[PDB]
Symmetry: T
């Protein structure tokens, strides 16, 4: 189960960075739609926190060792962060979230595949459920942005 543990830990790092990025969007948001999207980022952060709980606990349960320092999150995550900026528009902010979500969904697909190969059905299900809700958020964010989900 080496690869299942590896992708779960990858998720630990990526979810940590994704939560940070979402927090930035939440904080620096400006433009029409703020009142609805500002708290929505908070909802998205709670959902990301949720996946982190599920995945980190599964990794520990499997005898793994979750990344657990900002240095490890940053260095292992494939997501890049930039300085907060109030001048970013609402469309740009939402587009950035969509792109973070597409990355997460692809990671979850890899997680699904890897765990399926090793026969780790519990881990497999964790990734399937997370991927489903994230893809649903992509649909809604894309709809707000006037586009098809284009998964």
């Amino acid at each position: 189960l080496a690869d299942s543990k590896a992708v779960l830990n990858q998720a630990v790092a990526d979810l940590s960075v994704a939560h940070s990025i979402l927090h930035q969007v939440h904080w620096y948001m400006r433009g029409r739609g703020f009142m609805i999207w500002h708290p929505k980022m908070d909802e998205y952060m709670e959902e990301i926190d949720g996946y982190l709980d599920e995945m980190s606990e599964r990794l520990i349960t499997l005898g793994g060792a979750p990344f657990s320092t900002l240095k490890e999150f940053s260095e292992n995550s494939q997501l890049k962060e930039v300085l907060g900026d109030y001048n970013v528009t609402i469309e740009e902010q939402l587009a950035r979230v969509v792109e973070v979500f597409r990355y997460l969904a692809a990671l979850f697909q890899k997680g699904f595949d890897v765990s399926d190969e090793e026969g780790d059905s519990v881990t497999n299900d964790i990734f399937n459920v997370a991927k489903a809700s994230i893809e649903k958020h992509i649909w809604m964010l894309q709809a707000e942005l006037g586009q098809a989900p284009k998964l």
Copy 2:
């Protein structure tokens, strides 16, 4: 529509088609305002289901037989449905809902008049209460569209 039972059945049919149109709007919606109006359509659907509950039950109680098949609903309703289209703008979608609600308000006024003439006070109140809430929604939808209610 010669009596109370008849207008009640007309309502069962129109409310059923109205529910379907609302669902279409809910599903095919795209554009800024999606996050607010997509779930709002679900509230409107719940409200419509509520009137269908009141009116169908009253019809049954009066010894009537409610239309209870999609064919009957579609054929007896005076509302017309068209294929779903993601390209309809958010504002055109809301304008469509307003048209549907104006029709229902007029239907309810007719039910009010008919039941009143026949002295069916219970049925009369049902239409009055439904008309009141529907008209209030017309005001809010029109306001979002930057217009007066124009009842």
Copy 3:
């Protein structure tokens, strides 16, 4: 690529819409001993069906599909058949009719399960699996009230 998953999801949209209509008819026209228990039960079943429609229509949209969204489309595309309401149908007959609709839906869900699996769409696969599980549990209970085994 997911065209078949999309088609079966849309098939479910049509069938679930017709099933909801049939359940409403049973709810309304029901008469006989047991009415007080089963009339409100139909409302629970309608909420359940609505839930499946939400899950499947949203997944279809998410996959880039276009859900049927008019009564004519639901009626023409659904394999279920509707009949005019009739107060003389017995309680047993009404429950048997619901069982028939539920067996059809359970069969439809197995089909959705199979198609999604074949196209590698695991999210859609799970949606059908969860819906099949709950609807089959209802068949057991309905059949039980009817003094019969589930006979899946």
Copy 4:
């Protein structure tokens, strides 16, 4: 001297005005509550587990109508009947001794007949109030008539019949 004291039969009845019908409702609802409670206690037969607690729900609904109508009567300056003697003597519903050997169909039919009477009384109260222009009282009777009639449909459906209002 002192004023002579009139000695006459009460008679009356006469559901002349809103206050009179509201008070008639106070009496009829009180006896109806008692009858429902009897059906509740003496019920036996298949279906007991569902209809026994249902009578309790019907009792609560009756209690509610009693609250609305008695309070409106007081608000109008009336004096509600408030003794079992006044309830029993003024109500047109007839009570009999409780009996455990009545089928469910028979119990439910009795409730339906009690409800048909109340719906009729409510229609009378609606007509009288409307004629007097007492719109508040008018709405009270209309609302109670509506729910009571819905109950008749359900009870009748259990009995395998149409509402037949």
Copy 5:
């Protein structure tokens, strides 16, 4: 002369019914400073009385008895006396009236306790003990409002 538990339970059915009626009268005809607090309290007392009625009638039926279930039986079997409602009674007179009814109920509950105890019917015994405890607590509060000791 209440021979057994069934007899005192049925006596309570009648007495609780009349007490409820009296409480309702006080609720309706109340006038004076304190109305805003005591008018609704009467409703609480009625609900409590209802509770005892539920517990005692159900126990009687469970024991194979037949509860009084008509106003005629309640009125005639009850020892409580009703009078026509009158808005000219003071708040303090109304409360004293309630205390009287409660003292009567408490005495009846003691009888039920003694009778059930002699019989060895501990279930019925507890019902009377519980009802008695709460009724006496109310007498204390009512009397306190009236500037008096409980004087049980």
Copy 6:
């Protein structure tokens, strides 16, 4: 629906002043009964606020323009205010609330009559329901003062 709109706006004005008077009674109350009636005035204010919501919204819904400045409320209201005074007795305060309520009940009856004549059944029901509740309050307030409702 000229008159209906006019009496609805009259109510907007009167309900706004009535709320102010209730608040005064709430704040300046002193004497035995304070603990019960002080919080009760807050309940009354909420009910008045509720009628204000129903009536102003219906007026907007009908194409009207609700009074929405303190100047308009004071000048259009038939209710008169006086400086707060802690020396008014509890019973005088309650009598004051009763007079305000008798006025509103009268206004609601007029609103009912006007709306009924113009055939505005939704407006008519709003006034009827508000009158029903205000009159119940009058009975209770009078009962506390040891009097009959005297509607």
Copy 7:
């Protein structure tokens, strides 16, 4: 010792409640016939109540210095109730009659518990049996009424 009998009847109850729970579960599972929708979940309510008595009686036994039976074999061997294989063909009315019989037994067992604990001066244990008996007897009345009969306690 002084409370040897109370402890023994509490333990007898632990065994009988455990087997009664098993029987109720069987009725819940194998039920078929008109009335299933109302009685199937009702059995679940009864199981919850039975479970509640087991909590009360086992805890009091432990509190008194006893050792509760806590293995299926002890439950089965000490209980006076007999179990039979599940059977879908038992009628709804036969199933309810069976529950009535189990309850009549529990009610009598609780009466013994009451008598024994009362004789030993264990008032706490006495009240526990009294409250349980009261509810089970109310259930016998309702089950019997559904079956068209008097409680016949």
Copy 8:
């Protein structure tokens, strides 16, 4: 000893009453994209204003003062200006109006803080501090919707 603390609390009583009236106007007359979220939001703001009114009026009465309690007193003592309701105002101008009212209240609360701090009335001082914090947080949000920095 607390003359100025009482004066500023009473100033708040008038200003909050007028601010409430202005918020109600914005609530009623609002038209434009965003109505569905900002219309209800105005009711939230009105409830918060009511809250401040409750706190400040009660503190004033508690300190032995006499709160303004007539529309005339509110109107004449408040420094906020009201104008006739107008449906033709844009959503964005309505929100800009709300921001102005809030900037004013936040300034008044700062005055309330300074004055009460000067007289050593710590309870009153905390009331103004807590109120100022929330109003300021609302200014940030409103400004953000309007694409601007809070600019306190």
Copy 9:
């Protein structure tokens, strides 16, 4: 019922002192187990307060006069208090609670007997119920201390 009133009042005093001891244990607790037992003392204080409500109210209802000053509580209670001391171990603090509870249970048995002798069944049940729960706690505390209840 002189004896029943007397034992009830004795309970008022002992429960008042027991509440103080429990509060002391709550405040001065130090050692492994603090996090679970500190809030537990709060639950015990609440239960004790409840018994005080029941017993003091019953005494008043019987025409008695409850002790209602710290002096009366201290002088009538058979429980002895000592100065708070952080040096007491968790296990000793729990053993002290057990000691107080054994006393309370013994007291309640005496109240049960006295009331039973005088025929005061209401008071009798109040003591029986309090005794039942206090003894259940003794079992649990003792179990935590690796011992049998030893009632």
Copy 10:
């Protein structure tokens, strides 16, 4: 009371005696108004317990040792207790509560001053919040008694 810890402990003692006095009032009350004031005393006791929680915990947190025996509360409190008396009038009882509350508010002001002096801002806030609420109660109690707060 030379420091924050000393004044916090003084409050522990005074709050303990205040609770006892409020309980006495709750138990011995007789007279019109009982039904509303008897339960109100329970609310006040709950509020008093709340201040005790906050102050005792803060003292412990600062390294102090709270008074934790009835002897300490009674001897350290500046409040005096007398035997319960059913003949005290309702008004007299409420006036007694007012005097206890005036003492507590005065003590809280001293705690506020001492802590502010020592720079202990956390403790300072605790006294400020408690003073705010007790003064509010004094206003309502005085109001029921037909008087101004007279702080």
Copy 11:
């Protein structure tokens, strides 16, 4: 036919019933530091075990099977062995016993997952996957309390 899916569901009915009994024993006989947190935790574990029994027995009935439903059947078909209750067992030994019971259940659920997957009974397969996931999470926690790795 789903022969083996039905057999493993019934094996679980037996094993869950015995596991519930063992957990109840640990619950009752527990003594030692940690009792206050672990005694009620056992109740939580029993409720969860109970839930799995509900799910698995219902699925078996739904599939046309016949759940074991007598203590004798549970005891004779279960692979778990029970011993007499003993208060002298330490807290840490009790938790270790629970871990052993849970390791067995987790293995049982893995077996049910594989068998159901083999036969194409995806509904049953999901039930076992869910149950296995939670039981394994508990093993991690229990082991952690015991100062050890999960060692699944």
Copy 12:
């Protein structure tokens, strides 16, 4: 208000790292006490998140720009992270949390000081409330460890 803003941002960084450390402790915990302290870390994280919300929001409100990347949190925080280790004893873990909390409390005192000095009363209150709760946790954590708070 430059220094208030600076200390608020320092807190954003320190709170972010503190959250990460708490999470590590939560995940890697092993030893008797796990079942109570594992969930407790979750409560602490939630509380830490709350301060982050209050402080980041106030910083934005004052015209500041909050650190919003893991790199900034890690580089600006004075707290140091180490690789997760399952062998560390429970008592060692709790001692580590105490050290993080002692640092946070000192940080909040500094924040209180700079804001008081600048006249920024709102920010001052935020640090005061947060310092209060953190110090309360230090007492409990120390108590579990058999020690005085030693603030």
